[model samples]
Target chain A: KYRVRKNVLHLTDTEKRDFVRTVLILKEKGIYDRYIAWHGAAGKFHTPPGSDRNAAHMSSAFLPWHREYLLRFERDLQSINPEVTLPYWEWETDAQMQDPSQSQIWSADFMGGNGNPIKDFIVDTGPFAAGRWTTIDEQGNPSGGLKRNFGATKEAPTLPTRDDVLNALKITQYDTPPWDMTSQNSFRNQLEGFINGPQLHNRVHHWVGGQMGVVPTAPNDPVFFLHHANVDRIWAVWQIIHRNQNYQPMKNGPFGQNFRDPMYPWNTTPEDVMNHRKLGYVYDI
Target chain B: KYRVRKNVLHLTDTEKRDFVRTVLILKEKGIYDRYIAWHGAAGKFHTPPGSDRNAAHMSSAFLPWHREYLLRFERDLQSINPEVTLPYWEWETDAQMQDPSQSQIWSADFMGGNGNPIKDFIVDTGPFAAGRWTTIDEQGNPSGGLKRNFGATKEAPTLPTRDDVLNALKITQYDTPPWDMTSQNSFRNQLEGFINGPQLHNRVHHWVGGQMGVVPTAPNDPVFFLHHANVDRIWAVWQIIHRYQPMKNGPFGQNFRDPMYPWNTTPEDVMNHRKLGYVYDI
Candidate 1:
């Protein structure tokens, strides 16, 4: 169940020693379960993947994939000692730039900020193209990569505008929303990299996605809770910059009802997305 | 949950008492819980509504609903005595239907070979009307009485031609077939009703719907075990029926392969209907 090989090339003296020591101390200190004293244990973070935001992916898209990913990393850390859960870093609120020189606070690879290109994406193209890989033209047989579709993943994870995720989330909100966080190829690639990217950049990107800037990363990401601890610190700063109107999306397009287009596959016809008050999410403290 | 009421009818004569007592004896002896025997120990007779067939009506639609219904009735009989499990009648097999003409086979108000004109239906109109229910008006809301589109139902029983049922079963066989059970509304109506109704009717229906049949009635319908027994019996009967090769559905508009309209909301294409292999019951 647990396998570990470091994918990261560079680790600074501070990130390598302090990060590892902090993780060991967290293991030594058994109060890791208390939510008030410590928000999240080491290496339990969540960043929802986005690309095929609608009903394109199969059901076990997000939660299961990230859960496995985080647990794998957690087991690797735990091998050194028996008692240790993944400690998180919430970077959004505490806006101390990991490196102050970077113009955009968040990592460039994460959210496509700091003069990076923003490309136009259509939802149907991702799944349609991937499905084509399942078959071969001659003899009606499965292709070499029959289990997985899509040649390569795209750069910078993308989410539909808040209204779009909300639209897809409308009717089937009975269970956890089925937006594929760890989808097969492109969708999972974009979301995982984006959520796990450099600090300041993810905050601005998440703000655009219409989430309250309370927690930076979800537990799905190994670094999610740690990233969010900093983000929670950033949220404390954001209150000073703009009080009451604490968070707002960048004015990319027209706002509110004028900008509300029907989400793909499921339209806004019955107005399931409109009633946000009735549909609410529960969070663990 | 168990109630006893004293009526003057049972005390009238030895014949009347005996007539009512016969059903009571069967209901007592026949597979109902042992409690019915002890609770109804002193009573002349007890008639507990329609046969298992009517209760089966609600069971097929909702499994849980029927489960609780049986338990409640079991408790009623147990109030008089502790030893009781609602003994069910496995009325489908030849061994179970020992005498169809027997008094146990008859229910007072039920429509059958002899019953009221309104209740004793010669045909089941719902399934015969091609899956349409007359519940809606032009604007689509409940409109009273005999709307044309109603699907077939067991609420009123009817006998279909044996040829009709045989051809319907042939939907599984895509050979130079016996009859076009796929395209015709007459075939669709009668077949759906016969398959979906009378408890055993649903066995073939679920087999068509692509699921395992686990309900007790699935094996217990007199029509089912027999028809399927015939279907099973056909394995033996086919030794004779196969000797003479005969019949086809004409030149072009024949077989399940030809495109036909869909039933229900599964939007299952008619072209895909012939893809299944016939399942045999053990």
Candidate 2:
């Protein structure tokens, strides 16, 4: 692929600086807020307007929806700075660290430091520190600032391990029937962290608490994109092995979850973005 | 303009039947639900966030936003049947009736009869009766069926009269500063019906009750579009004299050239409905 998404730890000072600058530029232009708004809307867009299954997550379309989300975001980044590409936060390797909080991704020049207890869990460091960046609640109102209480939850006290990701990749099925959180043997469900959820993708969100912890307001964190970049790479690796196992419920799934169904908020379908390489970006690994 | 949006009372039996059939087709194919979802999203998309002004309502963008809404909806209807165009519900004239509930728009053939008292206000007659059509709540969950209790609320016991519509058009300024529900002498605010608080557009919604009663879930009823079409026509008539006001001093999305949310179509893009390639049949 022409675009190579590198690991966040591997990025040079200039690269991190440029990515942050591009995002800040987008925010100033009001474009970045649209991505936040877009993700928020998709979560509430139930496939049939009654079920818990949304257009973005907790279903077979989870991976594809996020794939589209990341791709569009990368394109927007390119709009601001063509040299800029999203970098992945390899949280599994960070989990190997004695103190995962010491990872360079948390550096002030980058995503900033953890929430300050003295400031009531408000992020008081980095370029996105409280006064630097603003956030919105689930209601789309001002929440004042970003907050992160890393590794704060008992259920997700640590990041998912390399083995957790590897064991998930061992699954052969892309997804299964009744494609939802309970869909066992589903690579989608497993990687979604729903099988033993808050496991991989869900776990990472929990590992980095605050806005990243919730579904609606998760994108409020810049780490959200970086974290998702790693999740996307894992799915890409899974795709490389299970080429024959395509997207599931290709026909009679829910309205937006089906292979060809036009995902709400946008018309792009899983069929439109089934191939990662076709989207013109790939992982450094 | 080839497309002429006519008064609802003027539409023939065949016209009414064709429009109803097209909407049902859209609902069955899962296309109509998107409009409901889109409208619901914009209501929560507050301009500058945390303010009373949403992308759709309670702001200067209200008129243009619904104009764009009706335009997009009409385009969808035309996609189904090119002969079909949205019609305006002139509720002001209907207000002159002794019992507006007995109007033809509420007849079994059109928007269905008044909500049944014994049936808990769910419409039991015509095309969108309880068993026939489905509705969704603000949370996007199934509310089971459409309901309408005409002139139900004491606050909006009567529809705004034709004289009321005339009085609103008399306001020269398109909108004023602060550009919210509190905007004084603003034609936008007056027609939005927040001056006396729920007088015109707001009153029409209150008069029709049920799904139409609330801001978020109003589009669940087919009448939501018709009601807005009339509201749009009123704004269109007002535009013939007064242009959009506070063009430069308003909020982000409400500015003349600033793109409105849910979709980026601006007030300048929809300033003239005839220039948008359609005109009302007066």
Report, for candidate 1, the interface RMSD: 32.2
In model 2, residue pairs whose N, Cα or C atoms come closer than 3 Å (at least 3 residues apart or on different chains), thus clashing, are A193-A197
Question: What's the CA RMSD for each of the models?
Answer: 22.5, 2.2
Winning model by DockQ: 2
Write the residue-wise lDDT of candidate 2 on A197-259 in tens digits: 679999999988899999989999999999989988998899889988888979999888899
In TM-score terms, candidate 2 sits at: 0.94
In angstroms, give how far residue B264 of model 1 lies from its true place: 25
Query: Residue by residue across A27-72, what tens digits does model 1's lDDT show?
Result: 2332111111111111111111112221111222222222323333
Off-target runs (Cα >4 Å) in candidate 2 are A277-280, B242-249, B274-277
> How much does each candidate deviate at the interface, measured as C-alpha RMSD after superposition?
32.2, 1.5
Instruction: For residues B7-125, write the lDDT of model 1, one tens digit per residue.
Output: 11222344333323332342332222121211111011101111121112221111111222233333444444443223222223322333432323222321112212253222123
Which lDDT tens digits does candidate 2 get at residues B178-272?
88999998999999999978899999999989989998889999999999999999988887777576577676788898777766688899887
TM-score of 1: 0.20
Please state the error at residue B100 of candidate 2 in Å. 1.3
TM-scores of chain A, one for each prediction: 0.25, 0.98
Per-prediction TM-score of chain B?
0.24, 0.98
